[PDB]
Amino acid sequence: KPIAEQIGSSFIQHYYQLFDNDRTQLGAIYIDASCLTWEGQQFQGKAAIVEKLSSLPFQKIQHSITAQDHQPTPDSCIISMVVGQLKADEDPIMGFHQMFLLKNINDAWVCTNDMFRLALHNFG
Amino acid sequence: GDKPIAEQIGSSFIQHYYQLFDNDRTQLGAIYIDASCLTWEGQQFQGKAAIVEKLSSLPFQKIQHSITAQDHQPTPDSCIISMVVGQLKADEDPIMGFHQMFLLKNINDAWVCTNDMFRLALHNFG
Secondary structure, three states: OOHHHHHHHHHHHHHHHHHHOOOOOOHHHEEEEEEEEEOOEEEEOHHHHHHHHHOOOOOOEEEEEEEEEEEEOOOOOEEEEEEEEEEEOOOOOEEEEEEEEEEEEOOEEEEEEEEEEEOOOOOO | OOOOHHHHHHHHHHHHHHHHHHHOHHHOHHHEEEEEEEEEOOEEEEOHHHHHHHHHHOOOOOEEEEEEEEEEEEOOOOOEEEEEEEEEEEOOOOOEEEEEEEEEEEOOOOEEEEEEEEEEOOOOOO
């Protein structure tokens, strides 16, 4: 597999393992200039992002990846786009779309730009 | 001073992109450069000429897209990244959700698409 899929796929396995288990380790994949758009709402900077992810109203969450597309950029970044499904506590499974822009800063691949959206919802 | 620069540039590009796609998709090569990368349904197309041939060959005569959601953010390199979630109706096929991502960059005073990733929904409703 290409190097952008290699890195890409490891990032999203890291990301979803941490979200699902210890999501107070999610701060380490973001820098201070990072931008998160969660369900149309914009959170700027590490502190605002880590506060938004820690405030989410659930105790247990599990994600599954249906498909993941990775691409190199001309400026040496990686774009990772995911389609999947999640189950928060005992609520119905919901679909989700999630997009990540990775940059290698100080010898580590960090997320500068993250956008998340729940699927449409056909009911409820 | 109001609405934000990434949202203005992104949203105008989205608008342009889907009007061209739904009217004449063969004029979509003007938005791409030589370094552009398209991922379409998991398949990987590098460069303008391979992207335009891919786009021109899709097997539909009429398409209509409708954007349910669009999220835009400036990046640290000064690019604009956009994520689109919506629906589409090609020919008389069922309505299908899609998701598309675009990376825009300002090269020689011109907003160009370097990176594009499209993926149809994997399930329908019928």
